[model samples]
Target: EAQPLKFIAVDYCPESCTHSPESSTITLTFDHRGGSRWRSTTRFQYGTFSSLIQCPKGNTSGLNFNIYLSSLEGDKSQDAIDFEFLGKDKRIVQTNYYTAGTGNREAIHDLGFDCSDGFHEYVIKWGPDLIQWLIDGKVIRSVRADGEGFPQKPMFLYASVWDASYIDEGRWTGPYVGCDAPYICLYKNVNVPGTAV
Candidate 1:
């Protein structure tokens, strides 16, 4: 049986992330209000993970809306892959991967349109030998996934928006000054394919 696509509030995201079952939307905010994250119960090893979501607008200098696969073992596992919207720019988004506990593989791509203007499909396909990042059915980047440190760990699906204030040198996403409180990132229709455990 397919599990219900329900979300339990992430324990780390106090006061920042919230869900509306009525709309199936999760919103993450900025400043003291914080950001939000919702995690699915499904866990997988190799498959596709995706979402249709919108980035927040207005003074969104150092925020991010991310749909990613992450290990449940906290920082120890650190195995993951991501499709993230750097709130500083609407014309581009980032794709990054981590193996074991280290991640330096980061790629930025032009999304061909402003992402904050509307909801768009963001996807990641992971297999034994390949990984792909897609936006609205078009492949934007791919990486060889057949070696050491590859993300082979079982991971759950996560969607979140958060402040990127801790980035060293503060250039990756930008510096968050204080956004109009209630800065909102919307997420819906999250889909994760079955895993071969």
Candidate 2:
């Protein structure tokens, strides 16, 4: 089933991001100035969220591209679910979740292909008791909310591209090599629980 959702660029729009209404695609660019981020207009409690993404190509070290869900922006005790693409390695993706602003549950999955080479479908099925991360309809990771810190708050869907060189002593993304400036990430076919067509 396909669901329609509206999105708006929240940071450095047009200057760093562009959305094509005709194609239903969003392009986020990261450069020396900064990166870009966008989010769904409405918050959702639970549902399956999916997006087809093509990450930035070239030596994208120290950068991060992601589609995730967040309870609130800059909240001290925020809940979030993440599908992070670390620029250091295009063949792997990092998955994690947060509850009440505490997050350490990080898992890396080998994708068997370069995410920047083409578009791939990434899906997150989040329910009351379970959360599953899927790649191209195949479940890669699943977590049960039994006695664990489960995200029960409503969250907005978001996607962004940014420089994450400062994290983990630059080991996280291997330090931003700005030579590949104006790196771009593309997104389309975003499906989530909302106005169904």
Candidate 3:
């Protein structure tokens, strides 16, 4: 197979989230909360120096790995939102994120597979050929990358939910801090092996 996926990791997904993972399925789950200040910052896709899911200042997009979003608390509707590094620069090197996977601020997936009523599992199949996103038990989106991620640097995990609602009008306001605070997303265990994926 494609290097049999080695690294598995997770984050508590801060703030306000209500998602559980199917432990029997995978090793790690990535989730995050959506704070107002941070959520609004997404408006700019300025690159590593100016990314909402801000990578440590000097960090380059040298790593690549699959990410399974166990849950998101802000726009429970999946709110058609995404996090990414874009704008100003068109050259892939100058862009924080070339893919809208996390940049589609307005196209959140409603009650995605992982962020179900309780705990669920999602998959980010990381390999050389392709990357796949799956829900509780279904593969939803899979696309090809131009030799994007493989044998790369140690992958990093960044998670956050922001408001893209303002993009609709002349008004500029958000990160849309929800009435809820202290959001959370949980994963029983991760990167152990013999696990789902």
Candidate 4:
């Protein structure tokens, strides 16, 4: 049945991301674990971090369910994905698949989170029309869930921390094996079919 889902970023929130319209809502709460400044969803590692979840069939084939992200607490890079996009003349690229999250450059991640401390919420809303990303009641980025040549399948929710392989490129460093330990991202609330919006 149609449903609502949630996801959390790992040790960091790179300009990486993914998109799909099958979701109803996604709330992201940032605990800011690394004690650093959070990176925005500006430019995917190599124009990679776009749709983390891919709806099954053609209904989810070609489309963009853009997302808005919260910053890391102690991020040293000091950049936001949105801000980065504004600086460049090009529109961001499409995110990768869910299979890419683990040890990959895309998909839902097993990043670090402070569950016991009551982590933050990154809420999201995905449908056939529009997708909305929320951070503590704030709308980060909303994009067309459906458009020409776009699929309309039911997509799942995805989240992860991307390691921008731009270490030599400066501005950032290390995928350092243990930046933020692995943990689970909880879904405390979900709205299923036949329920209220």
Q: What is the C-alpha lDDT of each candidate?
A: 0.76, 0.87, 0.27, 0.28
Please, what are the lDDT tens digits per residue for candidate 3 over residues 78-148?
A: 21112222111112111022231243212224432122134444444443345444444555555555654
**Models ranked on TM-score:** 2, 1, 3, 4
Which lDDT tens digits does candidate 1 get at residues 1-197? 12335655475665777666676666666557566677776577788777788877676777777888887636765888888878677788998988888888888899888887899988888877788998998999998865566888788788777888568656877777664656778777766674624
Per-candidate clashes, comma-separated: 2, 0, 26, 42
C-alpha RMSD of each candidate structure in angstroms: 2.5, 2.0, 14.5, 16.1
Global lDDT for candidate 3? 0.27
Specify the poorest-scoring 10-residue window by lDDT in model 4: 82-91
Error of 4 at 57 (Å): 37
**Candidate 4, 18-78: lDDT as tens digits:** 2234543232222223211222222121111222221111111111222332222223432
Model 3: lowest-lDDT 10 consecutive positions: 44-53
Report the Cα lDDT for candidate 1: 0.76
Residue 166's lDDT in candidate 4: 43
Q: What clash count does candidate 1 reach?
A: 2
Model 2 C-alpha lDDT versus the unseen true structure: 0.87
The CA lDDT at 41 in model 4 is 24
Which candidate order results from sorting by lDDT in descending order?
2, 1, 4, 3
Candidate 3 versus the native: TM-score? Answer: 0.36
